[PDB]
Design a protein around this nucleic acid. Structure first.
Lengths: 171, 137, 25, 234, 54, 191, 165
RNA sequence: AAGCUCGUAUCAGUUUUAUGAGGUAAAGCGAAAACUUUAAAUAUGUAAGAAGUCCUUGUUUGAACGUGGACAUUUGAAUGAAGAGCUUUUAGUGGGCCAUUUUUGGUAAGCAGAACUGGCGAUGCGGGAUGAACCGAACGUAGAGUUAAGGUGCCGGAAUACACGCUCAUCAGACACCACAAAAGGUGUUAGUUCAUCUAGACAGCCGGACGGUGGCCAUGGAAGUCGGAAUCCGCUAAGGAGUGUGUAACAACUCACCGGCCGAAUGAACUA
RNA sequence: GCAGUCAAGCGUUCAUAGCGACAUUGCUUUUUGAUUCUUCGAUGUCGGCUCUUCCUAUCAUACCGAAGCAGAAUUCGGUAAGCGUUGGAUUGUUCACCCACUAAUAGGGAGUGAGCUGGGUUUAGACCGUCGUGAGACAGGUUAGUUUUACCCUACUGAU
């Protein structure tokens, strides 16, 4: 599904003589608000000893893209705990928004690495501003000046089940 | 199996001087055509072996010069072992080896016929099966 | 292989610059 | 390449590749010696017997000779006008192109320019250069010298080295009993003719090196004069 | 990195000296004291003079 | 890794012309004419100007890209096929039986004939392929000379002639005899 | 081995330049049922009387055995499954010596099979140790030790046994 | 099944609350992990009021028993519910399979013993091509509408839908799978991860160099780096082994190793999927 | 097999806490081709005539590859099941062996207990041995000893 990005803040519950703990905040990519809070307490157990019943959400908010038209160049840290112990992975996606990029990555990870949605930590998604900081080859491919390329073998989707023309790619 | 101090025991222990008493005793076992053994008296019989052998069997020649050093492409071997002594000695010692060879050509020719039938190109009949019996499983 | 990588090291420092000072005084 | 790649022939030798530090050894030693001596010569010497360089390094043990890579010594001396260890120096670092061939000395200028103008030795034909000798190999049996002798002196060439002549030297041969037989007088070159790589090696195989070698040098630096002097000798 | 990496490692590695040698002292400092519990204390402190000798 | 577009460059000398409809190439120049079909390969050609031709593969992978490089080599061989030509020199070593070798014209088919191979009675014939010439080397003994415009119509016709005199069921170290490729060359000589 | 070359007890003189808790190593062997290890041998012309049993496993017998009358016999220890010499190893010193078997003291998985001499895995046997030459304090050399077997000598023909030290 | 003996506010394959115990180790931190308090869930017991309590102050100051009096329903957590016992009588049926959960003991490998709960039997129905145990599913008779599980090329009802990636198989796969052959092999591909190298110009190829002591010692018909035996070093060096191979009867010659030129810009190695 | 050894890896982090691929040592009769004649309990029935078909894990024939492969002959290997693959002697037994022919005498499967049988289902008869007081049973051994379809459906071959 088409995700969303979520600022999620939790503060685990003030007790007597401990008012006001320190308002922990994460950036969560998820579909809806329910999965995000479910995803939220999950990280909070791995980081340290807080648990879901012990605390509460302060607030949750959706992060829109600041420039949803500008094509950006994204650097992504992913580590994941397979098949033996974990390891990082850095892949670069030329894309439009933050939430656009993660979508193809989950398409990518489920393509090659049989990676579940649970299997994956998104550590950090960074925009590369400056060209010639983009390191992968195939992202550097589309950056040369005055890019032109053909489409070869243009199929045409037929509507009805018959045609009379021996149709040809067009061209 | 329980643990125990025995099994880690010493069981069938000899006494010392009785060995020489028994190494003596293999000489005087005079047989009887009127007597038969019944019980054996289990003894460490291999310790009571070793009569005075006087031949000392051969040294293991593989120890010095193994195979690859002895012959082949590698063959680190140039002069013979033991490379016998003198020429007139060598003339001598082969001359009976001449004779002793043809003596068995004279002698075994008495034993054959076993070559003539090959040139005659005929073989003998089979063994009859009744000579086998028995000799059966 | 990550471009914005050297920034992260000082962010490890500035949290630990406090943590040496905060646990004592 | 994920697969289908070319693999490398692993080997077992002693000497490993030297690497960057040997280039750093040279890069210091020259600049150490630049202010040491006075007179610097920039020798263009291409193909040498390694024992001849042994003789030239013992031609005097007083001064130091430096050989190594060109682009080292460019970086050692200095390429731009600004980047230079000493001054006016990118004039003559600009002047070294071939297999160089650097020399420090503190001797006499006339003596140095006398010395190599005097010195000349024999060498192989060394291809893409013409070598004035022409060889029709005689039409019968080859010989290990290759007919530059009374043929009664020489052994025939080795039957083991036949197919190199048959394949790589391209020359037609055969062996009747193992003395290598050819049939016709076969020329390999003509005189005053630029030699080919297949043409040269046959003379190098026969050991017939009747081509002269001498070093050339063009330029010359002086420290205390801070000048670049050039003189093409050959 | 590598400079920052090793001091993150050596403080771990210096503790392997300091913390284990704190124990292996106190592990033996209870050893003879456990041995002192049964046998008479004039004999044990006598034996403490034996151990300090070598 | 999904290369978007690659190219090679075919360098064309002066005396030759090429004529390329869909994937069919005619090569015309001094020594003759050459043609080749390429409908199986899916490339794209473009003349820039009269001496250079870029070829192209758009949006391909390795197996598709590796097909592109070898197209360049084939056309070059056709270009040299009309300029400099190809020459294979072969020699036929016999030990004891003098191998008779002739050309016969069996119903216009031009057969190279080998008689008395190794004391045989079977007489072998190789059909000369089209557009390759065969001559018997004068003034240098025991050599045969094959020449034509194509690479492959020479080399296969060269190789078939030395596969036909194979020695069967013998030790090959003692028996040497056969016809062998001696030398690969050009019909020019000098350039 | 190339790169190691890239970098760079105490027998006496006559002996160099020459070559080479009380628990047993095996408690708790698996049990063996009495319905197996006995192929019930039916007898009679109509083979319908059976009453006879054949021990299917390897066996130390004794020495003066001499098979008993057939109408008297009930249990069968056939000739092929009669092992007299074991292949005996030593834990220390790394030697395996082919030794003859003296007696069978403790077999688990019955008290019977001790009397029957049934060589399963885990049985404690008595071995002639004449060749090793153990010497007691007293100098009265020992030619008998308990060795427990190791292998399952059904599943291979040889008996392999560890000297209890 | 027959009944009057209840149509009371009494109960419940349930939690909460307190009290328990296995502290499993995770706080943690103390006095020099060695605390002794304490922090969770994993399944489990016990208890949660009307005969309920106090007071009166006797019996045999306490306690164990008592006389008597006072304290009503916000009457003593949640949630669901008129079906709890009686007296009578009395049909069938008492040996069996499968799965999960712990737990103990196991070995070629299957397991074996317990405890617990499901399913099956006696039970159709939709699906899994077909099936005692798989997935779904509350069996009167019909109509309409919506779904489950599973599907939607054609048998076959339903998108030859859309979207991104991956894969070519000389018996691919469409699944029993998180198991068995199974640990690996492969110049098949795809994506990584870490190490190195590089305009003081790598990588690949041509070109040239690749040497003096020195034919290093014994060794032997001859062994010059290259049948072997052991040593294995200095000089000179840009770099060159007391030698990678090929080769000779020995030499030669070639090779590589390592340099150097030429070329011009990326590349190697080892892993993981 | 059993007991080690080595160690590329593995191990919660990891060498040293353990596993551990690949290698490798323990004797398993003598170092001098002399023997070595060693047969040690198959409790379960098949063998065999006639005839078909399949498998390839190939003996021959076809093609090749490799070898001190000179030839000649042979070994090892790859493709390959197209077609080949016997005659006998021997029951004091053959869970086989020998001797001969031949290109070669390859190995199996679905077997052929209603196609026929020989041994063995195997009943009463009898003898010997073993055991039992006996009737009898058997560690055995020996001999004699009746099941008898087809015309039906189908398949199959021929026929209208």
């Amino acid at each position: 599904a088409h995700f969303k990005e979520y600022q999620v803040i939790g503060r685990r519950l003030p007790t007597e003589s401990v008012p006001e703990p320190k308002l922990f905040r994460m950036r969560i990519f998820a579909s809806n608000e329910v999965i995000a809070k479910s995803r939220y307490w999950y990280f909070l157990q791995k980081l340290h000893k807080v648990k879901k019943a012990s605390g509460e959400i302060v607030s949750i908010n959706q992060i829109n893209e600041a420039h949803p038209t500008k094509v950006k160049n994204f650097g992504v840290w992913v580590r994941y705990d397979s098949r033996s112990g974990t390891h990082n992975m850095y892949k670069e996606i030329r894309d439009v928004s933050r939430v656009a990029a993660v979508e193809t990555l989950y398409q990518d990870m489920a393509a090659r690495h049989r990676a579940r949605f649970r299997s994956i930590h998104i550590l950090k998604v960074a925009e590369i501003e400056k060209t010639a900081d983009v390191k992968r080859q195939y992202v550097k491919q589309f950056l040369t000046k005055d890019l032109k390329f053909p489409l070869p073998h243009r199929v045409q989707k037929s509507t009805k089940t018959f045609s009379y023309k021996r149709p040809s790619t067009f061209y | 199996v329980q643990p125990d101090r025995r099994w880690f025991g010493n069981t069938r222990v000899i006494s010392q001087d009785a060995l020489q008493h028994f190494r003596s005793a293999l000489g005087e076992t005079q047989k009887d055509t009127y007597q038969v053994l019944l019980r054996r008296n289990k003894l460490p019989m291999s310790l009571l072996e070793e009569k005075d052998a006087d031949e000392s069997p051969k040294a293991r020649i593989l120890d010095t010069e193994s195979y690859a050093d002895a012959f082949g492409p590698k063959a680190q071997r140039k002069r013979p072992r033991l490379a016998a002594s003198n020429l007139e000695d060598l003339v001598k010692a082969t001359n009976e080896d001449i004779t002793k060879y043809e003596e068995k050509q004279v002698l075994d020719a008495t034993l054959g016929g076993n070559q003539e039938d090959k040139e005659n190109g005929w073989t003998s009949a089979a063994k009859e099966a009744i000579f086998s019996k028995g000799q059966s499983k | 292989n990550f471009p914005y990588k050297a920034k992260i090291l000082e962010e490890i420092e500035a949290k630990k610059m406090k943590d040496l000072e905060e646990r004592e005084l | 390449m994920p697969r289908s790649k070319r693999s490398k022939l692993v080997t077992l030798a002693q000497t490993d590749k030297k690497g960057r530090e040997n280039k750093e050894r040279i890069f210091d030693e020259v600049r150490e010696a630049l202010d040491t001596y006075r007179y610097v010569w920039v020798l263009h010497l291409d193909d040498v017997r390694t024992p001849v360089l042994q003789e030239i390094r013992t031609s005097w043990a007083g001064s130091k000779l430096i050989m190594g890579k060109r682009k080292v010594l460019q970086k050692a001396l200095g390429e731009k006008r600004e980047e230079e260890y000493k001054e006016n120096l990118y004039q003559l670092s600009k002047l070294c192109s071939g297999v160089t061939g650097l020399l420090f000395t503190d001797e006499d200028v006339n003596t140095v320019k006398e010395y190599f103008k005097s010195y000349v030795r024999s060498d192989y034909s060394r291809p893409n250069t013409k070598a004035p000798l022409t060889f029709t190999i005689p039409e019968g049996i080859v010989y290990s010298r290759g007919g530059q002798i009374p043929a009664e002196e020489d052994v025939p060439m080795i039957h083991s080295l036949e197919p190199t002549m048959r394949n790589k030297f391209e020359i037609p041969t055969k062996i009747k009993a193992g003395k290598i037989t050819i049939d016709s007088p076969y020329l390999v070159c003509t005189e005053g003719e630029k030699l080919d790589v297949r043409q040269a090696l046959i003379l190098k195989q026969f050991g017939i090196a009747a081509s002269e070698f001498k070093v050339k040098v063009s330029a010359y630096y002086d420290n205390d004069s801070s000048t670049v002097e050039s003189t093409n000798i050959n | 990195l590598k400079a920052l990496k090793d001091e993150k490692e050596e403080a771990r590695q210096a503790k392997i000296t300091m913390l284990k040698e704190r124990r292996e002292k106190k592990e033996e400092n209870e050893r003879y004291e456990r041995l002192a519990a049964k046998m008479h204390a004039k004999k044990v402190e006598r034996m403490r003079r034996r151990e300090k000798r070598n | 890794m999904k290369y978007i577009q690659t190219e090679q460059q075919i360098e064309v000398p002066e005396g030759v012309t090429v004529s390329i409809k869909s994937r069919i190439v005619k090569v015309v120049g001094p020594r003759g004419t050459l043609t080749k079909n390429l409908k199986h390969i899916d490339v794209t050609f473009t003349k820039v100007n009269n001496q250079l031709i870029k070829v192209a593969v758009h949006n391909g992978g390795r197996k598709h890209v590796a097909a592109l490089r070898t197209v360049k080599s084939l056309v070059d061989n056709m270009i040299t096929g009309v300029t400099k030509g190809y020459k294979y020199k072969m020699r036929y070593v016999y030990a004891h039986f003098p191998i008779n070798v002739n050309i016969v014209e069996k119903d216009g088919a031009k057969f190279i004939e080998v008689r008395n191979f190794l004391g045989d009675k079977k007489i072998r014939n190789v059909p000369v392929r089209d557009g390759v010439t065969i001559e018997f080397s004068t003034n240098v003994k025991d050599e045969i000379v094959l020449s034509g415009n194509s690479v492959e119509d020479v080399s296969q016709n060269a190789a078939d002639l030395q596969q036909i005199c194979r020695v069967r069921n013998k030790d090959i170290r003692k028996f040497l005899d056969g016809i062998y490729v001696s030398h690969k060359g050009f019909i020019t000589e000098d350039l | 081995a190339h790169e190691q070359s890239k970098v760079k007890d105490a027998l006496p003189t006559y002996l160099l330049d020459r070559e080479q808790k009380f628990s047993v190593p095996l408690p708790k062997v698996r049990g063996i049922s009495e319905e197996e290890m006995f192929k019930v041998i039916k007898t009679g012309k109509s083979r319908s009387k059976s009453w006879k049993r054949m021990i299917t496993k390897h066996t130390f017998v004794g020495e003066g055995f001499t098979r008993r009358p057939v109408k008297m016999e009930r249990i069968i220890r056939p000739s092929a499954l009669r092992q007299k010499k074991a292949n005996v190893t030593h834990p220390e010193l790394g030697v395996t010596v082919f030794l003859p078997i003296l007696a069978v003291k403790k077999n688990p998985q019955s008290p019977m099979y001790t009397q029957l001499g049934v060589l399963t895995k885990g049985t404690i046997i008595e071995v002639n140790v004449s060749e090793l030459g153990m010497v007691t304090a007293g100098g009265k050399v020992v030619w008998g030790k308990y060795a427990q077997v190791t292998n399952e000598p059904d599943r291979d023909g040889c008996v392999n046994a560890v000297l209890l030290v």
